[PDB]
């Protein structure tokens, strides 16, 4: 039908769960502190 599909421009087709470009590649490269424990 449309050579450029619907789901890409359609705001009605916009993901309620579109988790964006910097979001995951930022919250991923973190490493939460290795010292949660006083001893370990």
């Amino acid at each position: 039908a449309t050579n450029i599909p619907r789901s890409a421009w359609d705001p009605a087709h916009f993901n309620t769960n579109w988790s964006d470009s910097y979001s995951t590649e930022i919250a991923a490269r973190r490493h939460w502190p290795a010292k949660k424990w006083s001893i370990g």
Binding site: A1, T2, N3
Partner: protein
């Protein structure tokens, strides 16, 4: 049936596809044995009018699926003219640096002709002005091995 198909064709030359496809819904859901191809023609004309060149192709493949009713040569002309008007429909400025893109919507045209050959609607039984752009597209996007 002529009244319902003219309901559709009047809405289709009005531009009110949101009402024409509604008529078609009532029909398909109630009297599909009484839907002929002139009503699908009303759709392929009205979506062409409202530039809904996605719904146009949707119903063309719908009809390639449902080979009942058979697509009159007017319907093949309708859809091909839709695709050519659409492939001349030009994109925006942020898209128009490298070329006029919807020229690619002139790629299905040969596949349209294949589905015509398989639906039994002779391509020579078109218009010559429309066959002008279509022979152009066949030397544009079409090649033999």
């Amino acid at each position: 049936i002529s009244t319902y198909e003219l309901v559709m064709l009047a809405l289709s030359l009005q531009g009110n596809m949101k009402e024409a496809e509604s008529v078609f819904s009532f029909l398909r859901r109630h009297h599909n044995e009484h839907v002929t191809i002139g009503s699908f023609n009303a759709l392929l004309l009205g979506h062409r009018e409202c530039r809904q060149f996605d719904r146009c192709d949707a119903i063309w493949q719908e009809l390639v699926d449902r080979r009942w009713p058979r697509a009159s040569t007017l319907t093949a002309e309708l859809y091909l003219r839709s695709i050519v008007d659409h492939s001349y429909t030009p994109t925006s400025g942020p898209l128009q640096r490298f070329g006029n893109i919807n020229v690619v919507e002139k790629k299905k045209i040969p596949l349209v002709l294949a589905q015509m050959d398989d639906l039994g609607i002779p391509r020579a039984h078109l218009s010559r002005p429309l066959m002008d752009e279509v022979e152009d597209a066949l030397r544009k996007f079409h090649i033999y091995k």
